[PDB]
Design a protein around this ligand. Sequence first.
Ligand SMILES: NC(=O)C1=CN([C@@H]2O[C@H](COP(=O)(O)OP(=O)(O)OC[C@H]3O[C@@H](n4cnc5c(N)ncnc54)[C@H](O)[C@@H]3O)[C@@H](O)[C@H]2O)C=CC1
Ligand SMILES: Cc1cc2nc3c(=O)[nH]c(=O)nc-3n(C[C@H](O)[C@H](O)[C@H](O)COP(=O)(O)O)c2cc1C
Ligand code: SF4
Ligand code: FES
Lengths: 217, 62, 433
Amino acid sequence: GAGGALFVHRDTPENNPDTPFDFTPENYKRIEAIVKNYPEGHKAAAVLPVLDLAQRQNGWLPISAMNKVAEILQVPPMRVYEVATFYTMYNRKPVGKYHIQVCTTTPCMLRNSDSILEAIQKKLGIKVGETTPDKLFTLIEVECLGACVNAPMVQINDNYYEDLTPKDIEEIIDELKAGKIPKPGPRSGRFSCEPAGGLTSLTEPPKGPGFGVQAGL
Amino acid sequence: WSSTADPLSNLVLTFSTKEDAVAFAEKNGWSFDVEERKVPKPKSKSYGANFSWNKRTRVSTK
Amino acid sequence: APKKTSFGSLKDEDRIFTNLYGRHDWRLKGAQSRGDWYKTKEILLKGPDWILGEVKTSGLRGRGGAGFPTGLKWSFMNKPSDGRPKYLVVNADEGEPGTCKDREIIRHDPHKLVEGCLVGGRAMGARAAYIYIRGEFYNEASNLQVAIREAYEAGLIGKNACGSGYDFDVFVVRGAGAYICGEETALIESIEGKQGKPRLKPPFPADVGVFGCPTTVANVETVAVSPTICRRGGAWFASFGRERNSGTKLFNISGHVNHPCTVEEEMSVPLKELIEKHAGGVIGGWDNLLAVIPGGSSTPLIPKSVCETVLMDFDALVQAQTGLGTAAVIVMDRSTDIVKAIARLIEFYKHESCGQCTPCREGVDWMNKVMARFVKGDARPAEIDSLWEISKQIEGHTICALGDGAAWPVQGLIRHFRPELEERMQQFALQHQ
Ligand SMILES: NC(=O)C1=CN([C@@H]2O[C@H](COP(=O)(O)OP(=O)(O)OC[C@H]3O[C@@H](n4cnc5c(N)ncnc54)[C@H](O)[C@@H]3O)[C@@H](O)[C@H]2O)C=CC1
Ligand SMILES: Cc1cc2nc3c(=O)[nH]c(=O)nc-3n(C[C@H](O)[C@H](O)[C@H](O)COP(=O)(O)O)c2cc1C
Ligand code: SF4
Ligand code: FES
């Protein structure tokens, strides 16, 4: 569907250039390490990580954070604005403590991602773009998180929970709202992308070093 | 409305070359001013220069 | 008997990614116990020309989906330097729907990718490697960083890498949610801190790449098989698969199968053999199969009658009016709304377009609207042909191949399921009077 989000910023008391943002000293050391990964005279290559780091410190990206990154990297603020509005992982509005992202693309849809989405909506009482009144959960739909073999799956704060049933995701949400850490990964009793039927391959013990080496090497 | 009294206010003639126009003006007794043709100079366009390693031609946006 | 005529039944001894399922230690010690970082110094001391020759003899084609010959592509960097540094960029974006092969390589065999980075960078005379991984793969990227730290501490990379006297660095840069950033020039632009908009070619990356320097962008699976190819030789890799379709391949089988999974198999294995052997078969039997997308969302679908004898290589699937792509097999049984699935793929492409060039930016959204109407049946049959023409207008007129990847699935749906579209339109016209 058409994106309900806007790509023009209007100043707000909650979000304006005078909104207080600054990197912590530990984050400044991290920024130094990031900047040293690129050649001299090409500092702007650090825009994507440093900006992301600001989010990891702030939860989201107020416009003051973008201005701070632009000032730090000697980059015009409009370039940072372009980066922040191009990439979907950046949050330009505040989100809940647990950002739930449900993949609804065709491989996941064929495995009933609709049931997972409706289970989440009913368990939380919100919709696919809303935030809970306690600011604990935000729910959205995303495209192909790259675990189609383990469909249907959900990402919560750079963790993957896969092989999902409605009961599984309800239990995960219950564990999250109690402060626990649900273990990421599949929930079907299967560890990874392996076949559930009994490991149709890689059953033999892995060979040693130099087993197939050619002559002359 | 806008009113005029000179009958030649809308007279524009087209010529293939400057010499033809000069000859036509001369045989009609009109004093003339000739301005030479302005052609844009050829320019060096390089798309790759948008991404230069050490030059200022590097662009900051696309 | 030479010239194998049947392909498949790949053995465990011949498999390259031996820790695909993460049942063994993914750290440095486990990788070394499995054959990684073995005689890397001798491979680097053989010289770039020997390595490029091994890759050329191997017949390896680009595992990122396009299948460009890897040796030829890497040979473009064998030129003398002109004062700029040289770079290897490893593509770990993995944005294609139905494709999850790279993620397993990163999380369970990171040292394979690291040694491949070293070997490929030596072959291409590249000072360092930048690994670009999608930002959703946070744990995979952290595992990769741990493996890189282990290789740095053991002296395998860095200054005097492996004792070979060659200096090589490995950097990991994380993207932020963009499927277009898997396109190599868009990836290069993303690394430089810009919007992920692809560049026009020429210049090709080997001339002007990251930071304006000579660069080679190579898929992670392509990179991670090069050290094994060098060690076992080009010929061993060459024997597997048909001619010009050599080696092994990682397949991700998803959709309406009993055991969706990622497996390693010989190149030219028949699709039916793959599905029934490794994925457990089609849900409800083979006769329940409706359609298969064989190479990720960008390849056109093929109906059941074609999937029965088709082989899973570049040339055979090209002959089947589709592509090998990422070798991501999405299976749809007869209970699938075939129009709705393709409409969802078109919506994906609509949400992933970078918006730089007119045909993609406008026509993909136009096709998304038309397909959304086609799902309901709101349109008229004539519009079907109109839609086809729209796809042809988009295809070949765009800066990058995302336009091709949006036009092809629609063309496949129209080619093989036109009666379904007309039948749905008939129902809509009937019920709405
Ligand atoms: N692995 C994944 O997750 C995804 C894979 N893909 C696949 O990518 C394929 C299309 O990608 P493209 O890069 O546009 O195909 P391409 O044919 O234009 O390029 C393939 C590779 O060969 C190089 N190359 C091609 N022609 C060259 C030339 N004349 N000189 C020098 N180098 C040359 C290119 O630099 C590139 O690296 C698609 O078929 C798709 O299956 C698409 C999306 C995601
Ligand atoms: C829209 C688009 C997305 C792409 N995404 C990826 C990707 O995620 N991973 C990848 O390896 N190649 C991707 N490619 C293909 C690359 O542009 C390039 O051809 C490939 O990385 C070359 O590596 P190889 O020669 O080792 O296959 C994509 C291409 C396009 C047009
Ligand atoms: S085809 Fe689409 S993604 Fe590619 S450059 Fe054009 S608008 Fe951007
Ligand atoms: S379709 Fe859901 S992860 Fe790819």
